[PDB]
Amino acid sequence: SSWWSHVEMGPPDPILGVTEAFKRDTNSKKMNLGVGAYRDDNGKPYVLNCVRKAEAMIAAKKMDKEYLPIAGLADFTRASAELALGENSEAFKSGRYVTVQGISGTGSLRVGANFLQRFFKFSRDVYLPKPSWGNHTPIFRDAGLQLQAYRYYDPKTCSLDFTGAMEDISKIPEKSIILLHACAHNPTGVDPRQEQWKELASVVKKRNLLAYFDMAYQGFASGDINRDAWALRHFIEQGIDVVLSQSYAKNMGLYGERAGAFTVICRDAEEAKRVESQLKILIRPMYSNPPMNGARIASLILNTPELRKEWLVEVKGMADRIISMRTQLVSNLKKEGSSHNWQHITDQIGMFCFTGLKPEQVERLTKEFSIYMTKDGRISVAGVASSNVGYLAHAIHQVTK
Amino acid sequence: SSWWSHVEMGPPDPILGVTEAFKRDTNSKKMNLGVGAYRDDNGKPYVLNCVRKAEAMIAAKKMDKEYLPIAGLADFTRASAELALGENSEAFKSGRYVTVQGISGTGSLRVGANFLQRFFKFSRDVYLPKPSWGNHTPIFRDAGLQLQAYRYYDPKTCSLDFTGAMEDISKIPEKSIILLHACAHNPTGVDPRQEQWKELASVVKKRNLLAYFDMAYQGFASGDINRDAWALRHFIEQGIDVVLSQSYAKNMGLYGERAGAFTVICRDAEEAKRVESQLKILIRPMYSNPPMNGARIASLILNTPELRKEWLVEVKGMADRIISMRTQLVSNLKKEGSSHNWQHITDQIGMFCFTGLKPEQVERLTKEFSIYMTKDGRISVAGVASSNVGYLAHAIHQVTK
Numbered sequence: 095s096s097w098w099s100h101v102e103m104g105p106p107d108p109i110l111g112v113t114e115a116f117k118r119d120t121n122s123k124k125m126n127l128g129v130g131a132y133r134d135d136n137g138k139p140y141v142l143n144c145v146r147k148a149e150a151m152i153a154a155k156k157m158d159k160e161y162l163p164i165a166g167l168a169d170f171t172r173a174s175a176e177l178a179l180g181e182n183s184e185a186f187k188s189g190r191y192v193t194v195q196g197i198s199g200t201g202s203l204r205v206g207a208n209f210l211q212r213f214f215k216f217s218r219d220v221y222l223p224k225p226s227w228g229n230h231t232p233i234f235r236d237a238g239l240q241l242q243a244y245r246y247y248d249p250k251t252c253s254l255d256f257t258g259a260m261e262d263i264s265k266i267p268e269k270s271i272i273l274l275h276a277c278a279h280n281p282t283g284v285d286p287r288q289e290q291w292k293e294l295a296s297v298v299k300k301r302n303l304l305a306y307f308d309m310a311y312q313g314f315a316s317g318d319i320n321r322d323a324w325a326l327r328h329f330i331e332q333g334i335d336v337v338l339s340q341s342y343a344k345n346m347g348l349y350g351e352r353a354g355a356f357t358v359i360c361r362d363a364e365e366a367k368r369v370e371s372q373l374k375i376l377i378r379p380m381y382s383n384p385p386m387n388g389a390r391i392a393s394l395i396l397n398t399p400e401l402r403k404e405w406l407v408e409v410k411g412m413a414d415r416i417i418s419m420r421t422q423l424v425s426n427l428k429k430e431g432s433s434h435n436w437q438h439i440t441d442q443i444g445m446f447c448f449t450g451l452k453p454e455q456v457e458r459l460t461k462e463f464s465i466y467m468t469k470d471g472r473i474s475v476a477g478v479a480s481s482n483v484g485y486l487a488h489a490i491h492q493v494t495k
Numbered sequence: 496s497s498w499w500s501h502v503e504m505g506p507p508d509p510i511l512g513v514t515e516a517f518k519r520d521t522n523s524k525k526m527n528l529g530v531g532a533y534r535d536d537n538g539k540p541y542v543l544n545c546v547r548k549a550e551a552m553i554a555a556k557k558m559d560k561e562y563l564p565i566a567g568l569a570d571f572t573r574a575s576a577e578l579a580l581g582e583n584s585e586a587f588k589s590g591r592y593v594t595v596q597g598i599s600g601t602g603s604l605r606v607g608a609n610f611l612q613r614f615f616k617f618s619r620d621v622y623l624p625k626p627s628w629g630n631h632t633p634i635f636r637d638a639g640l641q642l643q644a645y646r647y648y649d650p651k652t653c654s655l656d657f658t659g660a661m662e663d664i665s666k667i668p669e670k671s672i673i674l675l676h677a678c679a680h681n682p683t684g685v686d687p688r689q690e691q692w693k694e695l696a697s698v699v700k701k702r703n704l705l706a707y708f709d710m711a712y713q714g715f716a717s718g719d720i721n722r723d724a725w726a727l728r729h730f731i732e733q734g735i736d737v738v739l740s741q742s743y744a745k746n747m748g749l750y751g752e753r754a755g756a757f758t759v760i761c762r763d764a765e766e767a768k769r770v771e772s773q774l775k776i777l778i779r780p781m782y783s784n785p786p787m788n789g790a791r792i793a794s795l796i797l798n799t800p801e802l803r804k805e806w807l808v809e810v811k812g813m814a815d816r817i818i819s820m821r822t823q824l825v826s827n828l829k830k831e832g833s834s835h836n837w838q839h840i841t842d843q844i845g846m847f848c849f850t851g852l853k854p855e856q857v858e859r860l861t862k863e864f865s866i867y868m869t870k871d872g873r874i875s876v877a878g879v880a881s882s883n884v885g886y887l888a889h890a891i892h893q894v895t896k
């Protein structure tokens with residue numbers, strides 16, 4: 095009998111553990127549609143070009159490796175707030191925001207969670223949309239908050255349940271926290287139309303809720319970064335002081351680099367200062383300071399007009415591919431004789447597809463064809479290459495027939 | 496009013512805050528002897544040659560940026576354990592340990608605290624040496640643990656108070672946590688001798704305390720990495736099953752790249768596997784997975800013989816440097832005419848010198864000479880160059896005369 099005799103075996107991450115499994119699989123035909131990481135046309139990891147170039151400018155600049163400030167690389171911090179809020183943004187232009195660099199979107203979400211935990215004085219309840227990215231839960235629960243939920247996706251409709259979203263939402267108690275995905279709702283793939291966003295926002299405003307936006311796929315909803323930040327900025331423009339999480343993980347394909355940020359909309363520029371100090375005091379004992387290379391790469395591209403332009407064309411290309419994949423997806427599905435409706439594959443947006451597959455359906459795909467995905471029938475459509483759209487289709491069909 | 500209208504403006508970090516201040520001083524002659532960050536003889540940031548080399552092989556390797564597993568890069572992982580534990584290590588050879596990559600030393604300390612709080616049931620109190628590094632307090636506190644202390648440094652004599660320490664230690668309640676700095680006690684720069692270390696082991700074994708080692712300067716106290724891990728290793732062979740934190744921040748001079756690790760020694764390999772599960776379960780909702788740049792490098796060096804060799808020679812060279820500065824500093828103080836004994840300057844090991852100066856004196860250094868240090872009068876020795884060594888000397892003379 096010792097120290098850790100009592101600790102039991104925990105399970106494998108529902109998302110992340112798929113990669114694990116994936117890697118152990120000897121079938122050469124294997125695919126990992128678990129997590130959402132973009133592959134190019136040959137099924138390979140794709141490092142954007144502007145990333146490479148920036149990588150190089152850093153190298154050639156022979157920079158040091160001294161510590162970052164707690165809040166991160168200023169230059170990155172600011173570029174992020176602009177990318178998000180928009181250059182013409184009041185809130186932006188008047189200095190009422192604070193943004194600290196974080197450990198990508200997860201770390202960002204968390205300090206955000208912990209900040210709410212420590213200062214938000216009116217409630218410990220956080221309302222998540224049904225369903226929501228799995229990590230949401232543990233991020234908020236480990237932070238000290240309790241979780242609630244508001245209806246969002248209708249499975250018989252394979253579309254948003256706006257009505258229910260609004261009934262639920264309209265009944266959330268005044269001054270509660272509501273997690274809203276900025277765009278590219280993980281895992282549904284469905285987001286509200288402007289008209290509906292416009293609507294939600296009135297109730298948030300109306301019920302005086304703290305709105306927490308998580309923006310991990312800016313650019314991926316449509317391929318247009320500003321058309322994707324519409325919602326967020328709207329809200330803010332109606333007078334809703336939100337909080338936000340951002341990740342350059344997917345859109346810059348800096349996955350393991352860890353680049354994200356957390357921002358808080360304040361009243362003044364004075365409040366902003368005040369809050370930052372606290373943010374910092376939250377962080378020091380967390381990780382001391384952030385990992386620098388990701389932000390360097392990113393800060394360089396955001397702030398270098400050339401780099402920036404190329405980036406944006408690369409992002410558009412990414413989106414485009416995926417789209418082609420959906421399209422190819424369903425057509426082969428028919429080509430294969432599938433009596434089922436597969437329009438969802440084409441109507442949804444972002445990096446996945448919320449297939450509808452049942453967990454048995456799910457297993458069979460892993461087992462028989464080594465196609466790896468999540469228990470919720472959620473597939474990374476972004477990890478499918480041209481050469482494998484066809485196999486996916488067969489498998490799916492085979493599983494679904 | 497406002498969500499945050501009550502958020503108070505907090506104070507700058509006791510250590511990390513001097514750098515901020517430092518950056519604002521316009522005197523050409525400033526020196527940042529605050530944080531323990533090494534500079535070459537010209538007072539310039541020193542990126543190790545083996546560091547420079549490893550980055551070159553990664554770029555040349557044209558590697559990807561995909562996510563790393565939760566615990567991190569296995570090679571990095573395996574390596575630090577070894578680095579720490581030793582290769583002839585039994586616990587290492589058997590695989591009774593679990594190492595997870597972390598966000599340098601802090602994030603390691605922090606996950607370790609977070610693990611303790613979750614699973615260590617036999618206590619809620621962590622015993623810190625007096626004094627300890629500043630960050631330790633908040634790390635544990637923020638983590639939900641209770642803080643205690645044992646005597647360590649006697650300031651009257653400016654030496655370790657082995658007696659008190661031992662009194663304090665022997666009466667720690669059974670099965671509590673005691674934090675011990677593996678080497679290079681920060682800020683004291685005063686470590687137990689091998690015979691005291693052998694005493695200490697004896698009682699922790701006896702009271703049957705949980706030993707948390709903080710190991711940040713492996714290689715900087717003695718100039719020899721193996722020599723620096725003697726006690727860690729000592730305790731282990733004595734059957735004390737430890738928890739340990741690593742920083743590659745100083746010794747690999749990888750500061751802002753954030754590389755480090757946390758490791759818990761377990762009874763079996765079986766059990767380690769169970770902890771590892773848990774450990775990962777803790778990290779995901781924290782920052783999902785660690786930054787990858789720093790680990791690639793580190794693992795590249797620790798795992799490539801040439802690289803490892805030169806690193807050892809690089810670290811030893813670093814260590815000798817600081818000994819030169821120490822010495823020079825005192826003899827310069829003599830020549831300037833300082834009435835006092837400045838023996839501790841040469842007695843203390845690691846990057847620093849715990850000078851014994853008073854607040855006023857330090858205030859005077861910053862103000863008049865622009866020399867920046869911690870209000871407890873702890874100077875960064877590793878921060879002085881051949882070229883500014885006199886300045887400091889004169890300063891310290893004028894403020895102390």
Ligand SMILES: *Cc1c(COP(=O)(O)O)cnc(C)c1O
Binds near residue numbers: 197
């Ligand atoms: C990817 C993602 C995030 C952030 O992930 P990181 O890799 O840590 O940047 C946050 N939310 C959702 C819904 C995501 O899909």
Ligand SMILES: *Cc1c(COP(=O)(O)O)cnc(C)c1O
Binds near residue numbers: 381382601755
């Ligand atoms: C520097 C140091 C650490 C680790 O520093 P990081 O920047 O987090 O890597 C841990 N403990 C002590 C006592 C230190 O001096």
